[PDB]
Amino acid sequence: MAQNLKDLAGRLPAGPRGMGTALKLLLGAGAVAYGVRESVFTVEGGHRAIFFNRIGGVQQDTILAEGLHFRIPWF
């Protein structure tokens, strides 16, 4: 399986100098996008979620409604 991936990676054309920079920027943008997606704990209607945390156990003073409320990934 890894051999196929290596062959595919090698087969990519060696585009101009700016092609690599553009690809790096696109990869960074996609990483930020997925971080954003999984950094918002997808709670559903009417529910809530305070931060069940792994840093500082679980906080008590911070209170969250349902909706725009960010998780830290897997945390």
Added chain:
Amino acid sequence: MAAKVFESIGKFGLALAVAGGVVNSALYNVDAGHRAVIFDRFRGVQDIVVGEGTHFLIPWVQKPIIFDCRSRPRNVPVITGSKDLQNVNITLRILFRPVASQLPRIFTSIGEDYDERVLPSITTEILKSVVARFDA
């Protein structure tokens, strides 16, 4: 020139089809006496009832909850003890309807199906209490 025109026409047709599909996916029929609600995820469920009208939404976040703000009966049988403590098997008939205004709370609190959990509950409680109080 003809080939470019045909290609542009095809691209415009595909774009129009995609837009029409997106618009269609954003609407749900509202049969008169149906007052839906928005069940999103970036807010959960909103605070504003959808009237008996076609009101818009965005995709994959709302699953069209076509409620029904019409009336409905129910029969509750209760094996109640009376004052003289009989086995009064009382089947009460109850008519009820919801309210258009605050349906989104109704959906958040319980969900799409609401009446079954409560009707036997309160009806049996009150039948038992009242008949218990009253002779057979």
